Paper text:
Enzymatic degradation of PET using suitable hydrolases, like the leaf branch compost cutinase (LCC) variant ICCG, offers potential for PET recycling under relatively mild reaction conditions. Computer-aided enzyme engineering performed by Tournier et al. introduced an Ile at LCC position F243 to enhance the enzyme’s catalytic activity by further expanding the substrate-binding site. Additionally, thermostability was increased to 94 °C by disulfide bond formation between D238C and S283C in combination with mutation Y127G. In this study, ICCG was utilized for the application of a crystal contact engineering strategy to increase crystallizability and test the rationality of the applied approach.
Thus, not a Glu-Lys interaction (as intended in), but a Glu-Arg interaction, was anticipated for the introduction of an electrostatic interaction at the crystal contact: Q6E (R139) and T110E (R119). On the contrary, the occurrence of initial crystals for mutant T110E (6 h) was highly decreased compared to the WT, with the crystal size slightly increasing with a comparable crystal amount (305.7 µm ± 78.2; 21 crystals). Additionally, the mutant crystallized at a reduced protein concentration (5 g L−1), indicating a shift in the nucleation window to reduced crystallization conditions. The crystallization onset at a reduced protein concentration was also slightly earlier (20 h). In crystals with the mutant T110E protein, the distance to intermolecular R119 was reduced to 6.2 Å. Although one T110E rotamer reduced the distance to R119 even more (4.5 Å), this rotamer clashed with neighboring N114. Nevertheless, negatively charged T110E, surrounded by an uncharged surface, pointing to the positive cavity of R119, supported the establishment of a long-range electrostatic interaction. The proximity of ICCGY mutant T110E to R119 indicates an established long-range (5–10 Å;) electrostatic Glu-Arg interaction at the crystal contact, confirming the successful extension of the approach. The nucleation window shift of T110E to a decreased protein concentration (5 g L−1) combined with a 77% reduction in the lag phase until crystallization (6 h) compared to the ICCGY WT (10 g L−1; 26 h) fulfill two criteria for increased crystallizability, as defined in the introduction. In contrast, mutant T110E, which was designed to introduce an electrostatic interaction at the crystal contact, crystallized better than the ICCGY wild type regarding crystallization onset and had an extended nucleation window towards reduced protein concentrations.
Numbering used by the authors: 2 to 258
Write the structure that this text describes.
Amino acid sequence: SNPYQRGPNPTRSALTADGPFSVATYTVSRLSVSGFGGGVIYYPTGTSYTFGGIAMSPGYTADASSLAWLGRRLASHGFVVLVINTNSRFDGPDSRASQLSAALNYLRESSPSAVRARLDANRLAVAGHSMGGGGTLRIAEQNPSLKAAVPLTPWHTDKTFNTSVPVLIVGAEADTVAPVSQHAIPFYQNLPSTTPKVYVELCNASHIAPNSNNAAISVYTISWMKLWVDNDTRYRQFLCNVNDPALCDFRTNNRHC
Ligand code: NA
């Protein structure tokens, strides 16, 4: 049952560290691609399987190296992950959406053959930090063929996204760049009530929390990607009946349980 199932039955511990797949990396040079600023692909190796893909955007003024840990973390749990650089580090959220869109096409059509051979391009998802998270919401609304969207400490001036793509948002309690009351929470509460949606808020975290190894971000991102990109119900346990001391708020419409 479930052709997309990969890796062992999960434990909470296992989801806070790199997973069972060896990871290869490929550098996409900035000038080799029109449509986005290049980036790094983290993808499984030593294996005959194919896996879903994820395009992931860094935040305002940031480089792809800022999410390198999470690009590696997700790939080692069984995903082909492209962390982009933006055409300009000053690009806003909707520009970032367009570049994720280009990056997804690139993964499908133009990435190296060793990458393409590991990818099932029928199963794609998006994630992003800050302004990259605002881009993540925009593209989920523009392109509902995406399997999941994970905005991290997201920023956008538009507060309503009418998308059917399952969304999990990570807010940071002490975030002063994109305050959760202005940004993350309105995004959560304005998504359609028929869309599977989860909001998690990190206790005592600021806007830079996604920029380094973070256990909660690791668990909830892996779990959401696994549940929706791989249809993997072994991961519902981390997302249902949640009682997590790391969190200072949790909201859900419970469609995923
Ligand atoms: Na709080």
